[PDB]
Design a protein around this ligand. Structure first.
Ligand SMILES: CC(=O)N[C@@H]1[C@@H](O)[C@H](O[C@@H]2O[C@H](CO)[C@@H](O)[C@H](O)[C@H]2NC(C)=O)[C@@H](CO)O[C@H]1O
Length: 368
């Protein structure tokens, strides 16, 4: 078919989550992205030797999957929220870009990957407390991308195979202001738009993680009118990302607050009293957890916003508000992918949906 299904798998799966690459149903995807490799002294390096290339040996399991599933393509994701601090230096000079690019080729040859996903959060501005930036990141993102495309073509020619280069990009359109998406689009095989994390516990007020369209009822301070999927997709199309390369990100987790005022809206867009219940940490629920414990269950009632096209849960007793991806919202996004001729769907992350409620809907709409 025409459509990709790009599943992020987190290395931390192989700990408490007890979800290993062998637990993946590879028939439901086109691509696994392995989150993450780190950057040390300008080089792509193993993120966690305890489960990646040793110990639980996630990499051995992923190569075993490629042999059982010839369609499958596995990419190593470099960076992420926590490990993006090394990108600015790596992209800054031709020598750093070569050093970086050559280390990336070395990595995928050693560990049997089919290419590289650049998850740089984010060029010029934005990112974790430890993140590093310079103004030259705007041009340097283009130049590092070109170095990688060049290193990967050369290595592909040597090796008798094709290596993919992809990237994860911010749902915030500041990312477009701070890059040359028209230029890098010619070198990336496809672009995973992170069309989620629009609202979260960083706000003391509740909101939707991934609302489909702008809801003008939502007017809390500094929340942009473009903090929604359709706005993000149209922004990247206008910035010069070709429709066929634009992959729409979907979250398989939810965010929660506690002590949200009910107001007129059953806790939606209301002042709250910090993080709500979570699975592996406060304020972040696996879809598995929501589905089993919360979805019209234990005092949590499901509501639908027919403007934003998003569902939420509210517990009037505790004032706990959950934003999560309902099947009603995800069907609208899968229809929208087809109507716009987009590159398919991406999701963070595959361990978060053990019954495959969202995984199966995505697979059935885009692959069959
Ligand atoms: C619309 C916007 O600017 N949202 C910001 C969020 O993106 C950001 O959350 C981070 O989003 C990344 C995806 O872009 C995730 O990889 C990352 O894990 C996530 N960080 C956290 C702490 O969950 C938040 C966080 O400060 O800020 C918003 O403004």
């Amino acid at each position: 078919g025409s459509y990709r299904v790009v599943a992020y798998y987190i290395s931390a799966g192989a700990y408490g989550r007890s979800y290993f690459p062998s637990d993946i149903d590879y028939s439901k995807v086109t691509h696994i992205n392995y989150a993450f490799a780190n950057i040390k002294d300008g080089e792509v390096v193993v993120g966690d030797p305890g489960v990646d290339d040793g110990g639980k040996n996630n990499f051995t399991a992923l190569r075993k999957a490629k042999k059982a599933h010839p369609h499958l393509r596995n990419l190593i994701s470099v960076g992420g929220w926590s490990w993006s601090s090394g990108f600015s230096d790596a992209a800054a000079t031709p020598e750093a870009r070569k050093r970086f690019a050559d280390s990336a080729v070395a990595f995928i040859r050693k560990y049997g990957f089919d290419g590289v996903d650049i998850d740089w959060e984010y060029p010029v501005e934005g990112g974790a407390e430890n993140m590093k930036h310079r103004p030259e990141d705007k041009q340097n993102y283009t130049l590092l991308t070109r170095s990688l495309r060049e290193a990967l073509d050369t290595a592909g020619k040597a090796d008798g195979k094709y290596y993919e280069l992809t990237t994860a990009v911010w749902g915030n359109d500041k990312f477009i202001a701070n890059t040359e998406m028209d230029k890098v689009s010619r070198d990336f095989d496809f672009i995973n738009v992170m069309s989620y994390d629009f609202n979260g516990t960083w706000n003391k007020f509740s909101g939707h993680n991934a609302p489909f369209v702008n809801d003008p009822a939502y007017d809390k301070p500094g929340i942009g009118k473009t903090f929604n999927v359709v706005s993000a997709v149209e922004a990247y199309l206008k910035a010069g990302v070709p429709a066929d390369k634009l992959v729409v990100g979907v979250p398989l987790y939810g965010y929660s607050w506690k002590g949200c005022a009910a107001g007129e809206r059953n806790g939606e867009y209301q002042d709250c009293n910090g993080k709500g219940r979570g699975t592996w940490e406060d304020g972040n629920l696996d879809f598995t957890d929501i589905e089993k414990n919360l979805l019209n269950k234990k005092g949590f009632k499901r509501y639908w916003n027919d403007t934003a096209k998003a569902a939420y849960l509210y517990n009037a007793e505790t004032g706990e508000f959950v934003t999560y991806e309902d099947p009603q919202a995800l069907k609208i996004k899968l229809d929208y992918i087809k109507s716009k001729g987009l590159g398919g769907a991406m999701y963070w992350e595959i361990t978060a949906d053990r019954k495959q409620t969202l995984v199966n809907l995505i697979a059935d709409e885009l692959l069959t």
